[PDB]
């Protein structure tokens, strides 16, 4: 599996045998926010 | 100028000191046909 990164555009591409398999965008997280990982409000407040 | 290619995605970029400059898609023309380059009929005759 071959991985190529385009630093300028923050894009990546995984390829096998010259065939595209995965694509998207990846970049370093500049300022992590612990608030992000706080557990969200439960859809059902009280399963009980 | 630095140019990187992703044959799998047929995408390219041109970066300048780590700054994106140009982007898009480029690939070899599989089946050229001269009929594409025939001059389209002019909307205005312009006879004079």
UniProtKB/Swiss-Prot annotation, chains A, B:
Tissue note: Ubiquitous. Prominent expression in brain, lung, liver and mammary gland.
Modification after translation: In adipocytes, S-nitrosylation of Fatty acid synthase occurs under physiological conditions and gradually increases during adipogenesis.
Superkingdom to which the source organism belongs: Eukaryota
Location of this chain's protein in the cell: Cytoplasm; Melanosome
Misc. remarks from the entry: The relatively low beta-ketoacyl synthase activity may be attributable to the low 4'-phosphopantetheine content of the protein.
Role played: Fatty acid synthetase is a multifunctional enzyme that catalyzes the de novo biosynthesis of long-chain saturated fatty acids starting from acetyl-CoA and malonyl-CoA in the presence of NADPH. This multifunctional protein contains 7 catalytic activities and a site for the binding of the prosthetic group 4'-phosphopantetheine of the acyl carrier protein ([ACP]) domain. (Microbial infection) Fatty acid synthetase activity is required for SARS coronavirus-2/SARS-CoV-2 replication.
Complexes and interactors: Homodimer which is arranged in a head to tail fashion. Interacts with CEACAM1; this interaction is insulin and phosphorylation-dependent; reduces fatty-acid synthase activity.
Protein name (record): Fatty acid synthase
Species whose genome carries this gene: Homo sapiens (Human)
Organism lineage: Eukaryota, Metazoa, Chordata, Craniata, Vertebrata
Encoding gene per record: FASN
């Amino acid at each position: 599996l071959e991985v190529r990164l385009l630093e300028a555009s923050r894009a990546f591409e995984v390829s096998e045998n010259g065939n595209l398999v995965v694509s998207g965008k990846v970049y370093q997280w500049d300022d992590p926010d612990p608030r992000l990982f706080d557990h969200p409000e439960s859809p059902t407040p009280n399963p009980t």
